[PDB]
């Protein structure tokens, strides 16, 4: 897992199942290229989304469908998704996890880096 | 007053409304001595908790009634309260807002404190 | 108006004073249409955004530039900015409230909806 | 794992390691007693508190001290700990898990339960 989400739930107090998540990196041109995409496990947990040798120096964006998961569960929440934008690997490769918490009107999100 | 709590409600996205809030201070037998308390307003506010001749250096304890919160909306929820402990300490003029978002199973804390 | 952002250090505990922020709204061809922009006081609140006339209906995307506050801090941070993207909706009388909390690898944003 | 125990540091985006936890029930008399207690591993997890059988129903308080991890690398904190109070297994036996994110001047806490 050099890129993995984690999401929970701040209302059932569970993993948040079932969360659509697309990740891009920004191109050469300045625009986002589609990078990987998934959608949470029943542990809330999305990994599989690419390789250590995929996964190159760059500017990344996750994005967390969090409007699709409340629609889906017949909630009306505010938010279209959880974006999440941040460079990665410039100082060599790392391994990220994107912890995510969500509420109808609220969420947070924590990155853990760790070396390889 | 140098003493001030926020409480918002990250379910209907508004301030938490007529919350209880209960205000403790710590005393020389490690009890927990009553300090204040109310109820927040429309605006999640709780003003006019105490003064700065009362507001001494010391271990701070508030206590906000989250449980009974959810309750009156129909929802069950994970904690009993939402505690939050502190050190008040004298090192420049300051004001302290202890700020707290609430959900179901899930509270955050943060201590905005400004001169 | 309908629209204010208030922004919060959680390291230093206080708000978070000269952060620019960038309003965009979301045009018919899928673009981000800039709307309003301006930077943070020292109460970490950006008013007079926006008007009643001029907010209608639509999706928006709130842009606050953390990484040069966390620079000018002298902290390296994970995030290159951090981005709110809602939906206003009518629906009875409403005032927006877009609230975040800072740190170096985290966020956290809350809507705090009143009429 | 019935009760687990999962701590972030929001400032240097990793797990917040050996952060002690002090776990406590209440009594049939109203006082908090001592029920387990242990400090975070490198990954920030604290298992090992307690079994099945002896996690009965009562109430729960899991203090992490906040103000001893802040203080141990040498930071100026504001809370003295971060403290999280439920009621567990009064429905049959649950399994627990409380996640907790640090920052110095703020702290939020999750709770993941699920049924064995």
Redesign the interface.
Known sequence: APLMVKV????????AINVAVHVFRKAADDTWEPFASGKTSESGELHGLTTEEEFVEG?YKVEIDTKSYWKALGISP????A?????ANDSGPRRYTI?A?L????????????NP
Do not use: M, N, Q
Not at 78 to 81: G, Y
């Open positions: 929970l739930d701040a209302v059932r107090g569970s993993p500017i505010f938010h279209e998704h974006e999440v934008v941040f460079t912890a918490l509420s109808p009107c609220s969420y947070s999100t924590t990155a853990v880096v760790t």
